[PDB]
């Protein structure tokens, strides 16, 4: 029993408008450098589709995530320590840039400098950002399948259509599409960390953010394969890997991540989750993969339980963090309401970025239809997105937790309409799914009204604890190059000293 905290995220897919604003803001801030111009820490994909990189969900091809051996032990699908080391000279599963897309730019300047007397109107053609050569044609992009862009038989190759008779969805009337925005899951049992030979990747103790140490990373590029979500991108220029860093510079003072605060749909929720690190391996190694979801909920801890409080304090969790955990929207949606679900819990990484499945227009039927248990509003059975699809995406194939979430959402709707339109109390739909009026009114507060202070409840990472914030506050930022940053030993070959440190020791004790 060791309590640790992390700011988790929940994305309400039902409210996602597929706008990509989250992707653009992340790109401008973190990945506009040559070498990672093709990398999209945050990217949104339209489903059905294979995604970015192409078919990333196909773990048989890419070898990402963990597997549970016969003996019950966990091992990266890539292979054990030695097997992995044996692939170091040439990672045989490594995705090529073409699996992402060849980054390109256009010769805009030709519009400006075209010579006098051109035979035709000038134009700006494409050019590779990798070779600088002229590109005859752009054949791919990071969001190439946007809004069902491509023949159905191509998009339906979607790993999530497994075990589903998809023929019926090729019919115009049964058409359907949803959006899947995604970043790094900042897992509790990250495969990346376990597949990096140099130990360059680590999970921060105080807030659970998983980072790739840019100093220590050696560019063995095995981690990229290890991540079953393909969220680690090789910086082709620096020779090192980079990944979503959960905007820690901001989270550290209590701010939302850029993609969270910039979400136009107001679908992202940030809230603390307390977990028992000592239960991680036990939970990620449960025999049946359909139990990983529940096994993980069991690893999370109740923030109002004084037993957990005292254990947290004893284990170093700051008071303000405990406080935040007790009013965490992520906890209300994952633990209480059961609306949020993990993404591919079967990879056994214990993902910390969860999702609320989306509703959808009712399916095609013989006639206008009949009033169901929810009146003019839809019953969960009438939704057009095949529920089995959502299950392959969020619950290892188990449709039960997905139906419960979808039903409760619809239930909430039924109750609120009774109230605001008929001016009457009607808890029939709520009772049917097991929610009380109070839970429903609260769900409505966080999901519908969604005040800024309720969507983001990020506590401080407290950079002052176990460190020396004073001399840092006085000297951080003066990057003259003292060459003493990064090590604990004060000795350095250039005979220098740290700018943000006090070297004249007090003689008065």
């Amino acid at each position: 029993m060791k309590i640790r905290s992390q700011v988790g995220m929940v994305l309400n897919l039902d409210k996602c408008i597929g706008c990509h604003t989250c992707s653009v803001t992340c790109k401008n801030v973190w990945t506009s450098r040559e070498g990672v111009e093709y990398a999209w820490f945050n990217n949104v994909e339209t489903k059905p589709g294979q995604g970015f990189p192409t078919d990333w969900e196909n773990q048989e091809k890419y070898k990402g995530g963990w597997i549970r051996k016969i003996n019950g032990k966990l091992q990266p699908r890539m292979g054990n320590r030695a097997m992995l080391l044996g692939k170091i000279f040439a990672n045989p599963h490594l995705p090529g840039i073409d699996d992402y897309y060849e980054p390109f730019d256009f010769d805009y300047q030709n519009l400006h400098t075209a010579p006098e007397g051109s035979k035709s109107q000038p134009i700006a053609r494409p050019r590779s950002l990798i070779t600088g050569e002229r590109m005859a044609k752009i054949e791919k992009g990071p969001n190439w399948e946007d809004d069902l862009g491509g023949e159905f038989d191509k998009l339906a190759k979607d790993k999530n259509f497994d075990n589903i008779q998809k023929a019926m969805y090729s019919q115009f009337e049964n058409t359907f599409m949803m959006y899947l925005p995604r970043l790094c899951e900042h897992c509790l049992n990250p495969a990346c960390v376990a597949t990096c030979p140099s130990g360059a990747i680590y999970k921060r103790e105080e807030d659970g953010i998983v980072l790739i140490d840019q100093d220590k990373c050696r560019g063995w590029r095995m981690c990229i394969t290890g991540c079953p979500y393909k969220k680690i991108y090789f910086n082709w220029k620096s020779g090192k890997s980079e990944k979503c860093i959960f905007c820690y510079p901001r989270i550290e003072a209590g701010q939302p991540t850029v993609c969270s605060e910039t979400c136009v749909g107001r679908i992202r929720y940030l809230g603390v989750l307390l977990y028992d690190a000592d239960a991680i391996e036990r939970a990620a190694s449960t025999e049946n993969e359909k139990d990983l979801y529940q096994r993980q909920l069991d690893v999370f801890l109740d923030p109002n339980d004084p037993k957990v409080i005292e254990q947290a304090i004893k284990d170093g969790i700051p008071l303000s963090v405990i406080e935040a955990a007790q009013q965490s929207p992520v906890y209300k949606m994952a633990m209480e309401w059961k609306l949020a679900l993990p993404l591919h819990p079967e990879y056994r990484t214990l993902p910390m970025v969860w999702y609320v499945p989306p509703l959808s227009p009712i399916q095609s039927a013989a006639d206008a239809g009949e009033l169901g248990s929810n009146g003019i509003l839809p019953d969960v059975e009438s939704l057009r997105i095949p529920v089995q699809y959502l299950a392959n995406l969020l619950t290892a194939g188990d449709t039960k937790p997905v139906l419960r979430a979808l039903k409760r959402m619809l239930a909430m709707r039924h109750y609120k309409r009774a109230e605001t339109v008929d001016g009457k109390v009607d808890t029939r739909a709520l009772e049917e799914v097991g929610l009380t009026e109070a839970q429903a009114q609260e769900m409505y507060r966080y999901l519908a009204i969604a005040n800024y202070e309720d969507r983001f409840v990020v506590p401080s990472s407290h950079r002052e604890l176990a460190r020396e914030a004073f001399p840092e506050k006085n000297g951080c930022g003066f990057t003259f190059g003292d060459g003493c940053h990064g090590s604990d030993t004060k000795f350095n070959l250039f005979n220098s000293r740290r700018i943000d440190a006090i070297d004249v020791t007090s003689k008065t004790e």
């Binding site: 320590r81 030695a82 140099s198 921060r204 100093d215 990373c217 050696r218 560019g219 590029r221 082709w236």
Partner: protein, 211 residues
Amino acid sequence: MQFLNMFFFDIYPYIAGAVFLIGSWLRYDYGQYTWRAASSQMLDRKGMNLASNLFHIGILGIFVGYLPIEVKQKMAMFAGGASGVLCLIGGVLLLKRRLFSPRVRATTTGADILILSLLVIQCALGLLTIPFSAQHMDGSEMMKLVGWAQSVVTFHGGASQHLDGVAFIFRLHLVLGMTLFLLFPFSRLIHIWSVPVEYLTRKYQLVRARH
């Protein structure tokens, strides 16, 4: 000739060694971000699996090499012969890719061309010495080279004397090989220092405390 002899085998080996060691330490302490393998696999996968493995498995087998002395020569001529052939094939393939694969050539640095070219040359020379050591199956050639090497690493003056009357080809091989050490800290070769041994016994999950 005698002057060049003392320079290349009495002095130079210490210049290259001083530059190799202090250069590695200085680049490690002040160039962490520049310390990487510089993989280029993602930009072009074709043939990298075969090429890279041939080269690495080849060159590494040679170094594991670098029971009387003449037995060792035999083993080194056939074992080192094969590894050197695998290595030379891999190297040549890696160089052809670096120079002519648009994506690799466009994003390469000069040092990558230089260091890989010198290694292919160094491997070709190595193979060319085989027929020369074949005229001294008693291991007499190998003995001289070993004598020199041991004198150099124990800081014993006169090292070049051990090389008295050895096939000229062995001279070049030694010069080029020391030159590689000299250019080591300023090329991608620094990845060699980082061979991930500790990984075989490391706990899977890593967590860094507040620091």
